[PDB]
Amino acid sequence: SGRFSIKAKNYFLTYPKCDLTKENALSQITNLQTPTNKLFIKICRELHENGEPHLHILIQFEGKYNCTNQRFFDLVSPTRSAHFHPNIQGAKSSSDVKSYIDKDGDVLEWGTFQIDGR
């Protein structure tokens, strides 16, 4: 009696124990089309204490993007015949995104972020 439908301006992709690189995810994500428009793209890598390689991503579209399908963010290994299903999360409102975006260091940056308001 319910369907998985995500609606937000910003989205966060999390790849658990994913050996996927930011470049591949960046190219794939960047190449990933949307019903809206991609503005800024922040890709930061993080290692889990479980010894598993984790990957964090933060994208923000010009308009509220509807991610009611976990097939769009379906990233696969261009080096291995393995597919990875990242966790799609809708980031509500908050500058916390800017804070994290500013938290650069050994990360990839694409597009230009813009805070709505005055």
Swiss-Prot record:
Residues binding a divalent metal cation, per UniProt: 46, 54, 56, 104
Subcellular location: Host nucleus
Motif RCR-1, residue numbers: 12-15
Source taxon at top rank: Viruses
Motif (RCR-2): 54-56
Recorded domain comment: There are 3 rolling circle replication (RCR) motifs. RCR-2 is probably involved in metal coordination. RCR-3 is required for phosphodiester bond cleavage for initiation of RCR.
Role summary: Essential for the replication of viral ssDNA. The closed circular ssDNA genome is first converted to a superhelical dsDNA. Rep binds a specific region at the genome origin of replication. It introduces an endonucleolytic nick within the conserved sequence 5'-TAATATTAC-3' in the intergenic region of the genome present in all geminiviruses, thereby initiating the rolling circle replication (RCR). Following cleavage, binds covalently to the 5'-phosphate of DNA as a tyrosyl ester. The cleavage gives rise to a free 3'-OH that serves as a primer for the cellular DNA polymerase.
Subunit structure: Homooligomer. Interacts with the replication enhancer protein (REn). Interacts with host retinoblastoma-related protein 1 (RBR1), and may thereby induce the transcription of host replicative enzymes even if the cell is not dividing anymore. Interacts with host PCNA. Interacts with host SCE1 protein.
Family affiliation: Belongs to the geminiviridae Rep protein family.
Protein name (record): Replication-associated protein
Source organism per UniProt: Tomato yellow leaf curl Sardinia virus (TYLCSV)
